[PDB]
Amino acid sequence: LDDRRKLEIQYEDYIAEVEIRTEYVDGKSNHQRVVYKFTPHQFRGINAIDIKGAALMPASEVERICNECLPKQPYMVDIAVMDKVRNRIEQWYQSRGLPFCYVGFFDGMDDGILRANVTEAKIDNVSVRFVRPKLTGDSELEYSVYDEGK
Amino acid sequence: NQIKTKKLVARRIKKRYKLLKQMPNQLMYSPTGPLLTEVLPSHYISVF
Amino acid sequence: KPLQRYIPQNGGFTWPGDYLRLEIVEMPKLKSINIKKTSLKQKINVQPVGIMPRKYLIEKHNIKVLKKKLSQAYSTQQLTKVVQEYKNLIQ
């Protein structure tokens, strides 16, 4: 019971159904094997993968990461390969600094293509705030906020 | 006290937003109660 | 709406015990390799396979009803024996 609860609660984005059963390996003995059967969330038809956006990432490796993530049969495809695709792309940006460049959403899904969309943000507004704290015997600091520094 | 903790556990199983955000297009998360019957008479759809 | 009648029918294009299994369904067929992708003429409008699981919990309800019934009669000293014999007769 607790194995089923822990496995169902740990990977709820990918599996969400585990059934566990036991069966005796031999008569006149209490030894028995236990089997775990998972039915993952499936997605009913994905043939191709496309990556859109991403004007900073060159075409030399988008091709190889689209080639790596391919399944074999088109008809019953698990959700988690979706989570594999962005796990490439995010990592690439996280290897190059860039903490605001991420895979936003997938917009294909009706013509059989899984199409990731990459969002790349840019700086718009720079603002400065002037604060000072106050010395008391309290553990929490209160502040005096100014629009302009002295 | 045990009842209040069980209500928090029930919220985590039933209204989990990481599953709610992807329910149009990636998953199927619908609000139902417990399953009451396994078999119904065939003309039940006439109530709709 | 005119309500529908639940009468078994006879005849058909098949002998009884069979259905029409070469009937055409508007639903696409995907090849294993896609390259230079364009689009699909017939789309897959409902893409997720929805298998949210609910169990039938009749035995748990019966145990809870048994506890309530022998708590109403002010005899919870009988609880372990009665619940144990009900669980034995489940087997």
From Swiss-Prot, chain C:
Compartments in which it is found: Plastid, Chloroplast membrane
Superkingdom per UniProt: Eukaryota
Family according to the record: Belongs to the ycf78 family.
Known function: Essential for cell growth. May be involved in binding chloroplast DNA to either the chloroplast envelope or the thylakoid membrane.
Protein name: Uncharacterized membrane protein ycf78
